[PDB]
Design a protein around this ligand. Structure first.
Ligand SMILES: [Fe+2]
Length: 295
C-alpha cells in the first residue's frame, strides 16, 4: 500500500546501526542514564522511515498529538522500512551483549514500536518516568527523531533530569537517537511550535520493578562519603517515590501548561501535601533538594 518510491536513495544499513550502538554508548547509558546518538541511521534511511510515517498519517492510520502502534502485522505490511525496523534486533543484540544485566527480551511481545505526530499546538506533557512502576515492563527507551532542519524555537525538545544533576535539553534533530533508562530517568517533552514526528521503541526487562529497586541502603561508608549514597540514588528506580517532591517546581510548571487536567493537578496537589505531612520523608526530600541546588 505504501507506493514504494522514496525521495532519496538509501541503504537499510543494519551494520551501521549495530556499530552505532557501541560499548561506549552502552557504558554511558548505564552510567549517566541516557545517551544521545547523532546521524544514527543515516540521512537516506531516516528519510525513508519518515516518508512511510507521513503516508500512514495521510491514510488516517494515526489515531488520537496522534499515535500508532506497529504491533499489527496487517499495518506493518503496508510500510516495508518500518516493518523491517520492527523486526530488526540490532538494538537488542548490542544492548544484551554490552548490558546483560538488564535482561532484555527478544520476544515480539516484549517490544513496542510507537509512532507519534505532534501537531505543534502546545498541549499537556507531564514530568514522568517511562516506567512509573507497577506492572510496567519497560527497561530501555529508544527515541528516533525525524524533524529536518529543526531550529531553535521549533521547540519539541526532550528535557532529561538525571536525578539531582543539571537538566539536559535535547533537540529533536533529524536522525538523532536518544536512549535512556525507562525506570530511572525522569523527563518531559517541551512544547512544540512546529509539526514533530518521533519514533519510539521500548525494550522490556525481565527484572524491572524488583523488590531491591523499591528500597535504599544507608551504609557505614556513606557517613564519610555522601556522594556514593547520592550516586546509588541517582541510578535507582526508588527515586520515582521522591521525584515529585524533589522536582515539585518542574512537575507543577508542566501542569500549568496542561491547564493552559483539573484531576491531574488535584492529584499533584494532594501528593505534595501528603509528603509534607510525612515529616521524615519531607526532611529527606528537602535535603535532596538542597543537593540539587548545590549542583
Ligand atoms: Fe516519555
Amino acid at each position: 500500500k505504501f507506493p514504494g518510491v522514496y525521495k532519496e536513495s538509501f541503504t537499510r544499513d543494519y551494520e551501521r546501526l549495530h556499530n552505532k550502538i557501541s560499548k561506549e554508548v552502552c557504558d554511558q547509558l548505564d552510567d549517566k542514564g541516557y545517551v544521545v546518538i547523532d546521524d544514527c541511521f543515516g540521512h537516506g534511511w531516516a528519510s525513508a522511515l519518515l516518508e512511510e510515517m507521513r503516508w500512514l498519517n495521510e491514510n488516517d492510520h494515526f489515531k488520537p498529538i496522534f499515535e500508532v502502534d506497529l504491533h499489527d502485522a496487517a499495518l506493518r505490511t503496508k510500510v516495508p522500512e518500518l516493518d523491517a525496523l520492527f523486526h530488526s534486533t540490532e538494538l537488542l543484540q548490542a544492548l544484551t551483549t554490552h548490558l546483560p544485566q538488564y535482561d532484555l527480551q527478544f520476544s515480539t511481545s516484549d517490544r513496542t514500536l510507537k509512532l507519534q505526530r505532534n501537531a505543534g499546538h502546545g498541549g499537556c506533557f507531564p514530568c514522568h518516568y517511562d516506567n512509573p512502576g507497577a506492572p510496567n515492563k519497560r527497561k530501555v527507551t529508544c527515541l528516533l527523531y525525524l524533524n529536518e532542519g529543526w531550529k531553535e524555537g521549533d521547540g519539541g525538545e526532550v528535557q532529561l533530569f538525571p536525578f539531582l544533576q543539571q537538566p539536559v535539553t535535547v533537540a529533536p534533530k533529524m536522525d538523532r537517537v536518544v536512549l535512556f533508562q525507562s525506570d530511572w530517568m525522569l523527563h518531559r517533552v517541551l512544547p512544540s511550535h512546529a509539526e514533530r514526528y518521533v519514533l519510539t521503541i521500548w525494550l522490556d526487562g525481565a527484572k524491572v520493578n524488583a523488590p531491591e529497586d523499591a528500597q535504599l541502603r544507608l551504609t557505614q561508608s556513606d557517613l564519610a562519603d555522601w556522594f556514593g549514597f547520592l550516586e546509588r540514588l541517582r541510578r535507582s528506580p526508588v527515586q520515582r517515590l521522591l521525584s515529585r517532591g524533589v522536582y515539585e517546581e518542574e512537575y507543577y510548571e508542566s501542569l500549568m501548561e496542561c491547564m493552559q487536567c483539573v484531576e491531574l493537578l488535584k492529584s499533584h496537589e494532594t501528593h505534595v501535601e501528603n509528603v509534607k505531612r510525612n515529616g521524615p520523608l519531607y526532611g529527606f526530600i528537602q535535603r535532596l533538594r538542597d543537593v540539587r541546588a548545590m549542583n
